[model samples]
Target chain A: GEIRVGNRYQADITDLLKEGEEDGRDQSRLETQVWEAHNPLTDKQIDQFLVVARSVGTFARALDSLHMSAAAASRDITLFHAMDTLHKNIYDISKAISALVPQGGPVLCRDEMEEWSASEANLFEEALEKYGKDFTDIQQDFLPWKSLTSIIEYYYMWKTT
Target chain B: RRKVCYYYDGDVGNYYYGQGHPMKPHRIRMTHNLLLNYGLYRKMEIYRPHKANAEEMTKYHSDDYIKFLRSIRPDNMSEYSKQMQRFNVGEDCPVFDGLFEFCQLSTGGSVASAVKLNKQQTDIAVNWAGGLHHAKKSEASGFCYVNDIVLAILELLKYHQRVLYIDIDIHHGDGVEEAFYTTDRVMTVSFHKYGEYFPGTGDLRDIGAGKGKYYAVNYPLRDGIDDESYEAIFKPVMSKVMEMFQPSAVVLQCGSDSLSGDRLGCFNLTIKGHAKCVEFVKSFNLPMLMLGGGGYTIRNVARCWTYETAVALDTEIPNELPYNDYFEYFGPDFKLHISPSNMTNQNTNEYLEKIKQRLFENLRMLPHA
Candidate 1:
């Protein structure tokens, strides 16, 4: 009678939580925190994303459709990469915090995948030149806070929108 | 031998979705231009559909929806503004000149292809203008005004015991999936970007309902999915689908928006990579219907579909695109392939591995296949 309520990626955490866990609690709620550790993000994080996301927003967004790399063309690693790296950092911070905090620690934040930090953005750019579009490598090297879906979503948004 | 049939009406390209619209009818013509220049026209039997009449389309669409489509015009927009809203028309789907006629031709091509296959006149049917998969029984969506794929499948069901609809559009084949959602005679499998994508209905758990339960299969993918990763899942899941479904007739929607350089496409699939799916489906050798769906970047859509036609014909064309009317579009490289984007392949192997495992679990629950 147990049904999965959160998205597919939210499953493993349930399996993890379920291991040392509760019976009658709503599974969707269990997945919701995991979604948060994925949040509204921090105040500094919010400020960092706003400046870069809007500034490097349009033309760079069209670069991928132009079939060129934001990393290769821009002398200073592109804003596109910055946005990606920021997501990675946001994702990693929360995941690490969540794992250690047990239940109540606000840990880190994302599911809504709100805002990311500029430091994360620069690292994403650094990872970009080295890694190109190999996202797995980007995840391991630069944006650990971000997950597969968020980065890909942002990559397209940064590339096109 | 795959007796390939190509369907086109010289007029199919004449209907334009208003300027700045991503869905281009001319790409169908642009595609044929390359097909002819590359000498691809000779490989198959060419058919100009006796355009689908309101009666034929009404077989799937509602009576009023058919009447509304037949009656509306760009000149009569104000008159039917309310009806337009009711039928989900106007935004992505616009009331262009010959709106109903355009629907007729696209729907006609698919229905005619179905007819050709039913009569055993062709082993594989290609309607480059068809595959408008988002249209519904009574509403228009995602720039599609008529569910040509659904109409065509109903035709297929007349002669074949079961039909399988496969969609590779970047957007979900929601309209098609919903139409066949309660029937066991047909199974719809669509692979598309799942979250925050247009027509967002195809999630991992959206297996069909009623007898259609488990018959509707969806592999919701992520952005920047590439050839290697695409095929990794495509081969195995499709392999199991073929083994379990035993579909008598197969409909493959080749929507080129999944191409790397598409205006709306985020997937990093190259021309060759996109064609790989066509080749894989061709290997099944079931009487198949090949149709076009969503593709925004006109040049790549033209290139992708033309190459797919060649694949279905089991003939190879050179990577260097031959000169044609729209030759300027293929400028600089003048090659058939579009390079995959430098964006990260976001569909991680781990996620893909998990996706396949879950898909297999869904397949195992099939009601005797």
Candidate 2:
């Protein structure tokens, strides 16, 4: 049996990215583009991803602006929920990026390990008392830095912890 | 009034995607119950979709991939670990019981919806069980196992010349885009979250390649885009697309994840905002195939699809959600419409205008259909 050197694959990705690279050749020179065949997380890709995740976070913030009206008008556990998918993935990919080259080190306050500031925690309780499980409002009206996902997770985890 | 036909399998709810997995087929059942409780079912022709076979699914999926879907089982996972990794089937797309059967029904519903459109049996055809758009030709991504949207579009193309695919899922419709990336026959327009998301491939610059270049439209949106803002672009861009492309038929993937309060989704679109996309598309009056996509929150999925079904029928249902098995899910306020969050719209007038301008330019670049 002959071991074949050629493996059939989807090179169309690189074909597309080639055009993208050429489109940004001079300006994107500093940020090296590396497309490893398997799973990888590098500095450049992570930087770009943060741009997207931040947009999502801001979007969640925007939706909660008048969530007080929503808290009263529409009642459901959904109001208590957040975009856990986005939160979890971003949390993971960030850690993955740092791990890819472990030069920059340990966190004093991880997303999980860190406790909310007393003001933030008190504010969440005040907001929760007014809006109940409507974390969207709790997030929008009070906790500016905390996301709906974070707030909701906090609300539930608050009871247990 | 448009003639509408809906395809749903009763066992659709029974098909589970493992415990605590985001993608839920039970929502389809809940959606059906909502339609029935609202008396929306009697307004349209309804049918339980026949299970699509491996041979039928092979119309678009690879032969080996179809075979893999047919043979893989949850209880017998040890032997197929290597094949599972090769196929990208673990974590995101777990091997649950009756996985192939679930895929068959979903594919069946969409294919049936397309065939009905092809035959001119109905002006508007919907299969809420379908729209599993992330499935690839030979690999499954995102939770989709079969690229039902591709197969259904293939069915439409067999009879129609210009087929327009509109995806409103929060995630990128990458599988469908890739399948038709080189052909002008199918133009995929996906409006999704682009920056640093799952299957983060639908960047604004990712128009179709080759002959299909410029045919693909990726309207990458940010979080907290409200109804007015979403429509601000959808209407104008689609108007140009319809004018230039003159698509004889349309395939709209109405994934409810774009709706506010979706578990996996990040957008802040209201039921009305999401349904408006359906309503606007229906105004064209072309033979249309409506399929489902990503929606994690069960109640929201039920509400959006149910409301969109009413839009397809060219009628309106009451705002109060009718009593159903999933009644408790809609607690506090048992209403049809979910209000937008007070979250500020991240998409500003400037950003929105730039996107609209860019999209219009892309539409202008299209060669004659």
Candidate 3:
């Protein structure tokens, strides 16, 4: 058989990077734009996906604000659980991005990212709890509420509390 | 309400190479029993799908491939002939006598589902025996012979330009996705556990290209994904997709492999969670077709589909297991009552945050008129 065709364009994975950023990042919007750039079946689909991206972005940013504050001053296990939950959410969001793509399209790049980012900020909290770290040991430096508040304050506060 | 179709013949056992094979045919009986005991068979019209003709199958498949399958005389063929490595049929798609016929029968279910839905004879149709998503036009992979989903979808395209197909199986629906990857007409969405898994495709960012770009959606889920988290991503995205594409019809492949107990599955989705998906899709009221894709545990497959039958019928039975002799199938250790998935009881607040944020970050497109 003849050689298969290579990809036409380099995927703008910067969207994935931007997805992990603190400021208002709507995974749905990112997915919609990526779809528009890569898989828009019709001119109409491309346009609709773009709008979904924006609306989904606004929605997600609000949720992000609450997550941080909810876990503020929490226990080690609590923090681990909190982060782990966030980890899955982000992973799914990333997948939703990938799903809206073509079969052999560019790798979405969020799962790896979740693993990389979650390694320090996530599993550590779990390990600490497993190894007997308490809330007092970690709460002083890492104010989850402040972290969440700052995140919302910086990006999502306009939409959320 | 959609009719339920079962292609299970108790005497119609799946012929395997040897004993102790993970893939056996007896489970077909198990699938029937589970459905029977749970009374799901009574809920919807049961169809014993007939085999597809060579000409009908050739619509999407190559003539060469059809000829090859026809050429196999299972009893007379040597192991070498059965191991036709050139055709991509080997250990996964081992040659058994009447193998080609069995494959044809399975594809027939897919064809049947497509036909019923297209005719609007029934608004929804299901074939649990189908979902052979692994087959190529000429090659076989992942224990699948003919790609039934592809065949059915191709048939669907003859009637309608816009179709949304969602695959919620554990493994990537690569073969099906690839078949439609270049087309502007079909929208395919798949959510599966990612990286290091089978088919090794459907990355978090592989949006389709050209007219087909974004037409194929793949959500390569990580381990420990619960219903709440899965729903957060699925519901919003699908709703957004419908809002955007406005497909004329929808095909949902509800493979139970994504369930919590399936040995092959990585993530955890309870029966209830999976049912919710069926419910959500049905609520859309699109002319729809549903098929079973990948489920290992025969008992679970039966339960899942039976449960799905109730949901599709728009009749809510109590989530608990039926009052009858459920213990015979699940054994005493099994918990018969319906329970919320593991993720549901946990803190969804944080997970929702991540889901919303990631969704926002991915939002790069605006809706078209």
Candidate 4:
């Protein structure tokens, strides 16, 4: 019932379109603007979470670039709590834009991420301190895009050769 | 009284992972040292535990789970496992180096305690570090890797007709209670603060179901409970239970969180007050096995358990502190502030009266059961 390996990508927007389907039509398409709202493949999302998710570029593309919050992904399974609502919108958008890149995770524009980081991001960072300590502690053991970048950068940077 | 044996060495397997980990075994060592320094060792026969072999472990744990645990020990502390999905280790039970080995020993000690008691070697035995009761037949939960009380009882049941296990940790004895929640052969009684606490379970009304109905008893306490208040409820009711079931023997899992000094402990109890609990249980004169449970603070644990040793031995120490030569064990940066009277709390009346009324009412209702 779920995607593991050897399956085609079901852009997360497919999930969002299902909700909008109450209007009586199944539309499958990818839009960058919609992707900006919900891409799990983006910085904050885990779909973009490569096995070695610690890398900066991969992390930024998944979370910061996608302008997605991983905290929101947990709620993507259920839209409850303030974090859940915000996450759902982004997840829906991610599903929409994800159809284009299919196998590729979403990555928000650098400027959009920059703006999110400068103003709105700080608030969530504070929230993360509270909600994410366990996640952070868990990450200390196996850091994802949220925590490890230096080692990931070092490992992957020289790989281009 | 039943006997409980423990596994102790100056070094327990390293269970610490991050500075954030609250379950530090170093504190366990500190308490052991204080017990020795206070000359509490000579009072009882100490069992230097031998790790239970595979056959013995299988007496309690599932063979497959044991295998899984053994396979994971080498890299339990690595960061990689946490990124994985939910299993028993989940958020609270972080994997650490040698975690599997320590789990075996801790739970093994509990089984050993029950094994000896069932053999009738000693009427009452004390295992100072055995009540890691939160674990289950399957996975580890809370700080517990295996439910020692469960294993011990399961082992004891091999011979005895029935077993009664009591837990007084501030938090609910959820796993143990859950394990026997449907079996009448084993009676589980736990007095713990309920809901709003960790594990947030163990309700009073959730008595055992099926054949275990009415066998699992819980008195969910309010936070900030004092020694007298607790006894007012527990003492007489326990007496009533003895009359009702007359178990072959009893297991006492005394977690030190009931003591006052622990920052995380919600209840307030002096060392003397805590020992009196052991003393009160001793009045049963039944084969009793005593095991240690959760205790966080170093100084407080040493004081409480050492005092319990005095109770178990049927001797009385000064109801005070600053024992002549025991100061250094307080460590390099230790300060001595607690006076003898301070530890005993000179008065046990107020807390006593507050709960007495409730205690009698509960006891009076027991005949209805």
Candidate 5:
């Protein structure tokens, strides 16, 4: 398993880190650049990164099913380190970011759509289109709302207060 | 005087269900760790069950499905898309490394646990990895690959004249209910959030059909139901089932997702509330097989199962979580008990009373009652 996804002048984490140690190539800088495009993720970006992080975690488990023994797989120490670094970095960045910026000012809005974000407003439209005014009739539609359930709930909490 | 046997291995904890899917097997590790750190393991007989052979699984699952499960590969998933579609395997049920191995081990633990109960070697059996209750005879559903609960119940039926299946997962135990839908010997009862939820089959009116009619009972509840509402309905309904069915043995699916803070569950049940269901079932004093089911929030799952294990053994545990390798996981407040303040109660007294009346009426229809 060559760990390179594509050739950006291909080298596994081991080769890059090795060069850094003996020749002072700044391994941390390399890791930062390789792991994430930005430090403080936006709320939307953090939510998206969580999806990718979940995929990485799933792939790690799938490695076992592929009959890649931990010991056999860990022979390439840099690949393992790369996986670990990415997981921690995603967690740290998501924890540090805040949710989407709320709309400002008092209840001066004449219409209901004036206050909600595009996604939030669109979600209501979708729900109405699917189930009309009653969302309680939902049964198997729970999965699509998985990522947004908590986000919407939090937004509602602020709205009411 | 009650003998308890614990079945587990390190492998069940090593598997992953992918990101954002809301199923984690590592919680099984957290559960074992809590048990050991709390010294609860010293009280029970622990065994590493042999991986269940293909023959054992074939009793409930199709051989072709089993073959697909054993040979399925993540890298080659696209090639096997037809089998994937047939078996209902996709994002929810991904092809990962050691997937079949996990299926074998988890089902093995459960089937082996039932064997011990049949032999009268233990009064109570616990298998934390075996309650993948949503799996079907020929297909996978709801993150479950194999129907371990059904397989174990079948084993129990060999010795016992009648076996009762109880599910406390937030989701309906549709697979198990459907499997034994026509059998009077094994009565299935499930308490879950109903209406618009995943795999939406557990309607209140979905009592069993034909000979199995009235044998299957479902409490399809609304979201935000709390500990009080759960206990109020759970105890009386179970008591009625006990007197009516008089099952010689019991298989309880203790899915921790019903607890508050679960990523997938909507119920606001506390640890005490969740464990109370186990405690009530234990009070029946029938031969029982306690199995784990759906729990997406890992920390809460660990806490819920650990506390329930204590309940099974009739032992006391400190309110503060015992310091262990996973101690850091229980941060902010290192307390054992959690209060679900914000999860409002959604069911009114009148609505609950009506559901209870319906259940009791169904129980009366049973000849045994």
Candidate 6:
């Protein structure tokens, strides 16, 4: 029957493994590589991100020109309009990556984080002046990200530590 | 016509809980400022609550816990370290300056409102500072030091035959639920996020035990539960509870943490969606006590309570937010409405129907209904 071994051989095999010599696998080296692989973004990765960003921006701008010219000619450009939106979205995604990367970036590198000053994160409070004088007004604009940024900063600190 | 009584104190907003701790007493002040700016305060009777003494607080809290709470001070912290650990006081419930006084003021406000309800002075009593539902009988918990809701409910029980305790906070009303777990007189219903969340313990299956069997109903919801889903579940569940329990009085903890964009909450409920719960409860025509609870995002909390206050007064509020001292706190849109859809609705139609079926089965067990 299929149930003949039914966990009886399982214990014997476990016993055999315990009594036998170590397996050929280099577990210690495997552990070392696994730990070493836990790393921050590389320069090559940042370069790739930037390249994607540039191409996305170029595509968005080219679409914008086509849409403007088509509008001027009073021609139907519904399909071009959809493609323009897609390119603009791709550009925004690329811009967000650029913000996260460290070279002249909004986000700080993990190593450079210790030299971080709160003043580096300034645009948010300054945004209050552009909005409203009411406390409710500034709070509603800034409220969603209040904890999000706090957690982001804490996460970075914890990751570095 | 129904009468509305408002309870507040001038000094409640001055205490600070160090840095980054989400509970801000100043939100209550912002709420009051908004109410005044909108002229909502003029429509109701407002009173400065008498500060509750240590003896009044001990009605629901342990005497030892109260003594420990009184002894701990920012300067005298090192001496009471053992007492602090025993009473669950630390980062979440820290020993700030005027800590005991703050508790007393909050406890006093809730108890005073409950008294107003008991005396038939008001059809609806609102206390913005008093929905600290996480505090237990012997310990501080989850940013709550004293069980003000428990104390207020105890006061209500003297006059009423049965009292319904409903909590709309994102966190479960565990402290209050545990207090009356063995009793049938007070039924505690909480709508909260369940599983691995903060202090997570509300399950739909925890329908009370002993004489209190089937009394504790819970809607253990998911992350992006919206206005439609919440209303769909809330209306049927609450209507059934009303018919079955036949509560002589109701205690509602209107915690704005359940609203969308709350720092600690994940539900996608708008200001209108949040206010609709209050409106539905008000329609029950019972003597009701309304109290505040967990809301980390202070501006949204202020918006919620201010709008709820207008709802309690049976008044219409305009979409245009009024300019006030705390006017700068609201932003970007600077309008009353926040666009929903930051969180996705996780509960499916089948799941909601299952919840309704289970809830109805529990309700059917009650003999009175």
**Native-to-model Cα distance after best TM-score fit, residue A80 in candidate 6, in Å:** 59
Q: Model 1, B51: alpha-carbon shift in Å?
A: 1.2
As a TM-score, model 2 comes out at 0.70
lDDT of 4 by residue, B65-114 (tens): 56666666535536536432334664677665566666656765666656
Please report how far candidate 6 places residue B363 from its true position, in Å. Answer: 1.2
Estimate, for each residue in A29-48, the C-alpha lDDT of model 3 and write its tens digit. 21111011112134354234
Q: What TM-score is obtained for chain B in each of the predicted models?
A: 0.98, 0.98, 0.86, 0.84, 0.98, 0.98
lDDT of 3 by residue, B200-289 (tens): 777756567666776666665667677777887788888877887788888888988888767677667888898889999988988787
lDDT of 1 by residue, A1-161 (tens): 01112221010111112335332322231111101112445546634543433334334344323333222222112322332344445545445333323464312222111244667666767876888766656766788877644554344324321
Model 1, B1-369: lDDT tens digits are 677887777567756565457776778877876776575664466666666778767777787888988888867889888888888888868777667778878887888778778767678988888888777666788888888888788777767778888999898888778777777788889899978878868788888776778888889888899899999889898989988988889999999899897899889999888889999999999999999988998888988998999998888799988755356666678888778778898898999888789889988987661
For every model shown, what is its TM-score relative to the native structure? Answer: 0.69, 0.70, 0.63, 0.61, 0.70, 0.70
Give the TM-score of chain A, superposed on the true chain A, for all candidates in the order listed: 0.29, 0.33, 0.20, 0.16, 0.19, 0.19
Stretches > 4 Å off in candidate 3 = A1-161, B1-18, B73-83, B318-327, B333-367
Quick one: best lDDT, which candidate?
Answer: 2
Model 6 over residues A1-161: C-alpha lDDT tens digits? Answer: 01011121111111112324432322232111101111243435533544444343334334435554322222112222222232334434444454433364332112112223465334334544575332333334654444332323322222322
TM-score of chain A of 6: 0.19
Candidate 4 chain B: 10-residue stretch with minimal lDDT: B336-345
1 versus 4: better TM-score goes to: 1
Model 4: share of real contacts kept: 0.00
Interface RMSD of each: 23.9, 20.6, 24.1, 28.0, 24.5, 29.1
Candidates' C-alpha lDDT: 0.71, 0.72, 0.58, 0.54, 0.71, 0.70
> Distance from true position, residue A90, model 3, in Å?
56
Q: Could you tell which candidate, 1 or 3, scores higher by TM-score?
A: 1
For model 6, the docking class works out as incorrect
**lDDT tens digits by residue: candidate 5, B236-257:** 9999999898898999999999
Two-chain DockQ for model 5: 0.01
DockQ of each: 0.01, 0.01, 0.01, 0.01, 0.01, 0.01
- Tens digits of per-residue lDDT for model 2, B11-130: 676665654578867788778778865767646766667778887688777779889879988666888898888788888798876789889888887877777776676899888888
